[PDB]
């Protein structure tokens, strides 16, 4: 089951069997991360590290005691020593709470990882903050989407993805305080 122990330092010696020595051994994306997953610690009671990430921007690297993530089974909540969870997220609202104050982003859909050391890793593509959404185009966009019933499977996968992002955005723009 474990018949090939690969790794970054193990790529050093085999590449030192077959490459010219005037090139040094190339670096790896493992070398540029200081936080792993299996190693014990970094929960310290109340606040765990969260990492809300988009491809284009980093939106939080701070510490929260709770995150509310919109999973495909529904809005769950990550407390401090939460179970390790690789959770797919539907279009919904990520609520990062550190106390009374709340930063609530509506996300496009993308995974969230709770790790065996308590660190949460939200990984979405588009993060629309709830105060910058257009409330006049949420209802105009679902109308053509609910009537476009086409004959191809691709747009049927694309229309089903179309209304479910809009419909969870109506319910995320109305009852905000």
């Amino acid at each position: 089951e474990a018949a090939a122990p690969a790794g970054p330092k193990e790529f050093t010696e085999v590449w030192n069997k077959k490459a010219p020595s005037t090139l040094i051994v190339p670096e790896f994306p493992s070398n540029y991360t200081a936080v792993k997953a299996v190693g014990e610690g970094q929960v310290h009671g109340d606040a765990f590290p969260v990492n809300f990430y988009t491809p284009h921007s980093i939106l939080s690297q701070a510490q929260k005691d709770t995150v509310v993530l919109p999973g495909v089974d529904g809005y769950f909540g990550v407390k401090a020593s939460h179970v390790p969870t690789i959770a797919q997220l539907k279009p919904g609202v990520v609520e990062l709470h550190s106390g009374a104050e709340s930063e609530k982003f509506f996300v496009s859909g993308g995974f969230a990882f709770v790790h065996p050391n308590g660190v949460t890793d939200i990984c979405v593509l588009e993060a629309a903050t709830l105060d910058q959404v257009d409330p006049a185009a949420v209802k105009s966009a679902l109308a053509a989407a609910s009537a476009a019933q086409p004959t191809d499977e691709f747009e049927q996968a694309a229309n089903r993805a179309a209304i479910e992002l809009y419909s969870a955005l109506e319910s995320a723009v109305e009852a905000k305080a």
């Binding site: 190339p26 495909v72 065996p116 593509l125």
Partner: protein, 106 residues
């Protein structure tokens, strides 16, 4: 395959996704990405970044005295081999988008 004219206007994630998808037209056990990482304005150390294919080879390297992935409780709609398929393609699209951003300013 030859991709070019990538850096003409700007590099986006949607552009890196279509470059990722054509690497999934071929169905390998792994991917290797070779790019120059922008450490400073002087040093550009060339990086090897690698992505394993989900239930073909990624699950097999994790079978260390059982499995290292079974600690995670999958909150997907379908089972673990389908969430790992979506997760590897999302791993390939960001490792490639970061590759052609690190290499563009290197």
């Amino acid at each position: 395959l030859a991709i070019a004219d990538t850096y003409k206007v700007r590099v986006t994630f949607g552009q890196a996704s279509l470059i990722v998808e054509e690497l999934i037209k071929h169905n390998p056990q792994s991917y290797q990405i070779l790019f120059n990482k922008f450490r400073s304005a002087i040093s550009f150390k060339p990086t090897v970044a690698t992505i394993l294919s989900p239930d073909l080879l990624e699950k097999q390297l994790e079978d260390v005295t059982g499995n290292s992935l079974d600690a995670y409780d999958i909150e997907a709609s379908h089972e673990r081999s389908d969430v790992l398929r979506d997760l590897t393609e999302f791993h390939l699209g960001v490792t490639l988008y970061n590759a052609m951003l690190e290499n563009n300013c290197s």
